[PDB]
C-alpha cells in the first residue's frame, strides 16, 4: 500500500558495504566513497518480487535479473527510495534508446555528473538496483514500451548492444528495485 522506507547505513567493516563497494570501485575506484545505504521498503520489494515472480514464469530459464546502476540527483532521491523508477521518473532520463529509466553496466556511466549530479555539498548519488531485464533487444528513439519479438510475445527491456551492453531501458512500474544508494565525491 503505503510504501514507506528505512534508510540504514553499511559500515565500512561489514562484507556487504565491501561487496556494494567494490561493484562500483571496478570503474569508479577514482571517486571516494562516504556511504553506502540500504533502502529497506517493503511494499516496494514485495511489488518487485511479485514482478520477478511473474517474468520467471515466463522466460523459462533466463536469469531475468542483473545489478545496475543508476546515477541521479539528491533531489530524486526521496521520490525513487519511495515509489522506485517509476513512469513518471521515466522523464529524466536520456532518449537514444527510448524513453524509460536507464540503468548502466558499469558505474562510471552513471558516475558522469548529468547524471549522479553533485549536491550543494559536491555529493554524487549512485544506486546499485536490481533490475528484470528480462529478454532483451536493441533499443531506439522512437520507443515508450519495449518492441514485440514477431510482429504477443514481447520483449522485457531493450538495450543499446545485445552481445556487448552497456545500458539497459527498463518501461514498467515495479520492474526494478533501489537495492543500496552510494555516496560519494571526486
Ligand atoms: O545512471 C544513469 N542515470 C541516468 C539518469 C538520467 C538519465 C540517464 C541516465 C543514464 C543513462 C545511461 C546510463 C546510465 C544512466
Redesign the pocket.
Known amino acids: 500500500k503505503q510504501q514507506n522506507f528505512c534508510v540504514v547505513e553499511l559500515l565500512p567493516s561489514d562484507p556487504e558495504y565491501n561487496t556494494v563497494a567494490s561493484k562500483f570501485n571496478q570503474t569508479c575506484s577514482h571517486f571516494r566513497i562516504e556511504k553506502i545505504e540500504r533502502i529497506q521498503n517493503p511494499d516496494l520489494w514485495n511489488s518487485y518480487q511479485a514482478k520477478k515472480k511473474t517474468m520467471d514464469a515466463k522466460n523459462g530459464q533466463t536469469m531475468n535479473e542483473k545489478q545496475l546502476?543508476?546515477?541521479?540527483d539528491a533531489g530524486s532521491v526521496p521520490h525513487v527510495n519511495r515509489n522506485g523508477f517509476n513512469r513518471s521518473y521515466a522523464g529524466?532520463?536520456?532518449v537514444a534508446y527510448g524513453k524509460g529509466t536507464?540503468?548502466?553496466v558499469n558505474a562510471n556511466?552513471?558516475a558522469?555528473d548529468t547524471?549522479?549530479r553533485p549536491d550543494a555539498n559536491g555529493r554524487k548519488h549512485?544506486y546499485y538496483v536490481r533490475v528484470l531485464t528480462g529478454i532483451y533487444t536493441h533499443g531506439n528513439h522512437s520507443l515508450i514500451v519495449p518492441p514485440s519479438k514477431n510482429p504477443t510475445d514481447l520483449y522485457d527491456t531493450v538495450t543499446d548492444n545485445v552481445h556487448h551492453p552497456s545500458?539497459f531501458v527498463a518501461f514498467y512500474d515495479y520492474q526494478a528495485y533501489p537495492e543500496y544508494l552510494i555516496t560519494f565525491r571526486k
Do not use: I, R
Not at 69 to 72: I, L, Q, S, W, Y
Open positions: 546502476f543508476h546515477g541521479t529524466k532520463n536520456a536507464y540503468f548502466a556511466y552513471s558522469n547524471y549522479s549512485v545500458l
